[PDB]
Design a protein around this ligand. Structure first.
Ligand SMILES: *[C@@H]1O[C@H](CO)[C@@H](O)[C@H](O)[C@H]1NC(C)=O
Ligand SMILES: *[C@@H]1O[C@H](CO)[C@@H](O)[C@H](O)[C@H]1NC(C)=O
Ligand SMILES: *[C@@H]1O[C@H](CO)[C@@H](O)[C@H](O)[C@H]1NC(C)=O
Ligand SMILES: *[C@@H]1O[C@H](CO)[C@@H](O)[C@H](O)[C@H]1NC(C)=O
Ligand SMILES: *[C@@H]1O[C@H](CO)[C@@H](O)[C@H](O)[C@H]1NC(C)=O
Ligand SMILES: *[C@@H]1O[C@H](CO)[C@@H](O)[C@H](O)[C@H]1NC(C)=O
Ligand SMILES: [Zn+2]
Lengths: 197, 588
């Protein structure tokens, strides 16, 4: 969040400051490249070619979206055509659904036996990316993070800040969740190396 | 499914990869233009051939959908643009013959010698600076005899093949096909017809006739001082004495005819040189102007990708001023900028062109154009009209902070601008009317020259020095006629320009003469302009004209309002001299 090197960094339903120290069951990460114009399409409630046929976001999102320019990475002279995108699809996409179908999309009523032509189109299209392209036309690398929460024990948590240590002065304390007040000083008895309290 | 859904899917397919091939071809063309060499020509030709083949294949595929079923009025417009079968109806032999005729015309016009004394090398300078009657007459007659005499039968065959091809496309004539641009159908209360354009131009010319008559009388009166024994008080101006080979513009006549020659004109070239402008501060000032108007910034890649000065000795490049719309968010300007006022004004013009290009980028590929052929140059030009005012130059630090202007300078500037604005309209009208009648078939092939010179005498008031038989083809000498170019755009451009200028100036709450008006620091005028600019070709040009001026059709009253003090001064000056011309008088 403090890198400040990302064009877009939005958290949906969660505050970036408060989530910096929070416990979740699991976290999901996704990465893909879209055109800079298509950046706004990646949001709950949005609709677009990317939104409908390439990647769908559930409206009740419980994570964050990070976006930044990628022109210097995947935009070359002559066009970087190593990235595809679905322009034609029979229907929309369910949230978090991956489609890799390459069947020739049919527009009219007449079927085509896998041959391009009238009323028959290829569902996937290539992206052209050059350094001379427009700002919205430039390629962008976008990472979206989703947070999972179930009844299973949590595994991921924010970095707890550890304070200092003082002795011989009656002060409040909290060790690993054990709270209380008193005076801290050394002792002589030694625990076994698996016990606290 | 329904035809509409299939058409939508087909257009969605076409726009993608149409943008791609267009961008590839534009990049190849820019690479050739910015860096001329043998290798780049091959790439440019290959890209053009690929784009043309793709366009023909896509038109062939789009021929399948019937246009009646679509009821969207935007998919219908895109289909109407795409299903332009056009010249492919001609047979293969006929198409080959037509292409050969066009190529021969281009070649013969490009390389024409009257000797040695080519058209641009010599000839031009002789016709603009000889000041000698015999030399100008010799050059005019020699160019006519060398070019127009040889372009006669090629032009006749061109006419017959083009007329037959136009009739093959369910059009009456080729002139009707040209007039098809000014046609909008399917909208109630906004429709227009091709038969409406034959009128609505004669009306404006009849309106603007008295001003041209007064100007012609004044020019002839001031010109009879020179060439003492070759000009008559009542009669027409000899053809070769208009300061040009064809007399299209009267700019070269300014040096002979000045109302107040004592007062210098406004020129800030020395002011620019003193402050040492670096040929980029000019575009910086243009961007400042367009930002202060209310229009957005320039793209980041504009300043780095585009080249704005001569590359140097090692790298050669043609740098005629040009604004590039390569697509994919790419804008460029090709200019050899120097520290001159003319370069400043043309930089403003091209910057306005770029601003117009940025407006409709969100529209589909087929609708990324102006409303018609006249809506673009006028928008580019009104920027230069706004930037040429003394008030703007005084606002900038280049002009003197304490400048006092007299009405003598106002008259000088008004006449200088009029000699180019109102001096070319009758010529355009006469040339286009003659071409329309020739294509329509009203003028037989044996009466081309007689009717041409009769129109020249009657409408323009220009008489030929020496008679021409039917072997001569004078109109074919012009670049546009021989090279298949339309010409009514220059007639519509000035009317649209002055209407837009008046609308933007009244929106800016300006008081006084129209020629001292400026639209800088006016956000509401910029918003009103941007409302029309963002439309593109999606909506009929009548509604686009209404969105700024408020009138559906073009009106010429603002043009006369612009030139009103000049008209009054001419009426005062010409109260004694004769007004009008006599057709009977001839130089021979
Ligand atoms: C122009 O093209 C020539 C091709 O011979 C090339 O050597 C040169 O570098 C080019 N100039 C540029 C890219 O500025
Ligand atoms: C025409 O189709 C476009 C989408 O392709 C749609 O936005 C527009 O509303 C349609 N026109 C009408 C009149 O419904
Ligand atoms: C293109 O050619 C076909 C030939 O079948 C013709 O029917 C059609 O009208 C042409 N398109 C035009 C003239 O726009
Ligand atoms: C955008 O225009 C504003 C208006 O003055 C200017 O301050 C700003 O620097 C411009 N930004 C860019 C990137 O051109
Ligand atoms: C426009 O506003 C700028 C802002 O200071 C000012 O310098 C300039 O003189 C103004 N010009 C006009 C014509 O109002
Ligand atoms: C306009 O210029 C003429 C030039 O002789 C001068 O006599 C006159 O006073 C000026 N002003 C007006 C209002 O005519
Ligand atoms: Zn222009």
């Amino acid at each position: 969040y403090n890198s400040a090197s990302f064009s877009t960094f939005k958290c949906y339903g969660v505050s970036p400051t408060k989530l910096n120290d929070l416990c979740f069951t699991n976290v999901y990460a996704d990465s893909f490249v879209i055109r800079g114009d298509e950046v706004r399409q990646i949001a709950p409630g949005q609709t677009g070619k990317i939104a409908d046929y390439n990647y769908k976001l559930p409206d009740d999102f419980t994570g964050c979206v990070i976006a930044w320019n990628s022109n210097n990475l995947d935009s070359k002279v002559g066009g970087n055509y190593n990235y595809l995108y679905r322009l034609f699809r029979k229907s929309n996409l369910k949230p978090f659904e991956r489609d890799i179908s390459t069947e020739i999309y049919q527009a009219g009523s007449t079927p085509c036996n896998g041959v391009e032509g009238f009323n028959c189109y290829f569902p996937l299209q290539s992206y052209g990316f050059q350094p001379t392209y427009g700002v919205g036309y430039q390629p962008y690398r976008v990472v979206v993070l989703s947070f999972e929460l179930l009844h299973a024990p949590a595994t991921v948590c924010g970095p707890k800040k550890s304070t200092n240590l003082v002795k011989n002065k009656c002060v409040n304390f909290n060790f690993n969740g054990l709270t209380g007040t008193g005076v801290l000083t050394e002792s002589n008895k030694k625990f076994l190396p698996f016990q606290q309290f | 499914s329904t035809i509409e859904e299939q058409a939508k899917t087909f257009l969605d397919k076409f726009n993608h990869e149409a943008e791609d091939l267009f961008y590839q071809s534009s990049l190849a063309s820019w690479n050739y233009n910015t860096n001329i060499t043998e290798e780049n020509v091959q790439n440019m030709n290959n890209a053009g051939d690929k784009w043309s083949a793709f366009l023909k294949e896509q038109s062939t595929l789009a021929q399948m959908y019937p246009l009646q079923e679509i009821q969207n009025l935007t998919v219908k417009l895109q289909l109407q643009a795409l299903q332009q079968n056009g010249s492919s109806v001609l047979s293969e032999d006929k198409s080959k013959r037509l292409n050969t005729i066009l190529n021969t015309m281009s070649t013969i016009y490009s390389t024409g010698k009257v000797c040695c004394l080519l058209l641009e090398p010599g000839l031009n300078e002789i016709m603009a600076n000889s000041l000698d009657y015999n030399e100008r007459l010799w050059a005019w007659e020699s160019w006519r005899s060398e070019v127009g005499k040889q372009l006669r039968p090629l032009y006749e065959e061109y006419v017959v093949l083009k007329n037959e091809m136009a009739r093959a496309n369910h059009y009456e004539d080729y002139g009707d096909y040209w007039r098809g641009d000014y046609e909008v159908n399917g909208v109630d209360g906004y429709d227009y017809s091709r038969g409406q354009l034959i009128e609505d131009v004669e009306h404006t010319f009849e309106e603007i006739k008295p001003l041209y008559e007064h100007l012609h009388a004044y020019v002839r009166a001031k010109l009879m001082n020179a060439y003492p024994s070759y000009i008559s008080p009542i009669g027409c101006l000899p053809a070769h004495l208009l300061g040009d080979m064809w007399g299209r513009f009267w700019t070269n006549l300014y040096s002979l005819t000045v109302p107040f020659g004592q007062k210098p004109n406004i020129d800030v070239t020395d002011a620019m040189v003193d402050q040492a402008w670096d040929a980029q501060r000019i575009f910086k000032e243009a961007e400042k102007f367009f930002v202060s108007v209310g229009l957005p910034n320039m793209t980041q890649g504009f300043w780095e990708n585009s080249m704005l000065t001569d590359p140097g000795n090692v790298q050669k490049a043609v740098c005629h001023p040009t604004a590039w719309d390569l697509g994919k968010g790419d804008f460029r300007i090709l200019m050899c900028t120097k520290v001159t006022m003319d370069d400043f004004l043309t930089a403003h013009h091209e910057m306005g062109h770029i601003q117009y290009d940025m407006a409709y980028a969100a529209q589909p590929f087929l609708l990324r154009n102006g409303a018609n052929e006249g809506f673009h140059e006028a928008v580019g030009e009104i920027m230069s009209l706004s930037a040429a005012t003394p008030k703007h130059l005084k606002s900038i630090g280049l002009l003197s902070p304490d400048f006092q202007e007299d009405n003598e300078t106002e008259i000088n500037f008004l006449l200088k601008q009029a000699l180019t604005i109102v001096g070319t309209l009758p010529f355009t009208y006469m040339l286009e009317k003659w071409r329309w009648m020739v294509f329509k078939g009203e003028i037989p092939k044996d009466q081309w020259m007689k009717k041409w010179w009769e129109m020249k005498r009657e409408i323009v008031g220009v008489v030929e020095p020496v008679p021409h038989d039917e072997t001569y083809c004078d109109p074919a000498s012009l670049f546009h006629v021989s090279n298949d170019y339309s010409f009514i755009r220059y007639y519509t451009r000035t009317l649209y320009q002055f209407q837009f200028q008046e609308a933007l100036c009244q929106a800016a709450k300006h008081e006084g003469p129209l020629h001292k008006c400026d639209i800088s620091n006016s956000t509401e005028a910029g918003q009103k302009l941007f409302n029309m600019l963002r439309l593109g070709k999606s909506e009929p040009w009548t509604l686009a004209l209404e969105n700024v001026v408020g009138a559906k059709n073009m009106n010429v009253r603002p043009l006369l309002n612009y030139f009103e003090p000049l008209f009054t001064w001419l009426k005062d000056q010409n109260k004694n001299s004769f007004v009008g011309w006599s057709t009977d008088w001839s130089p021979y």
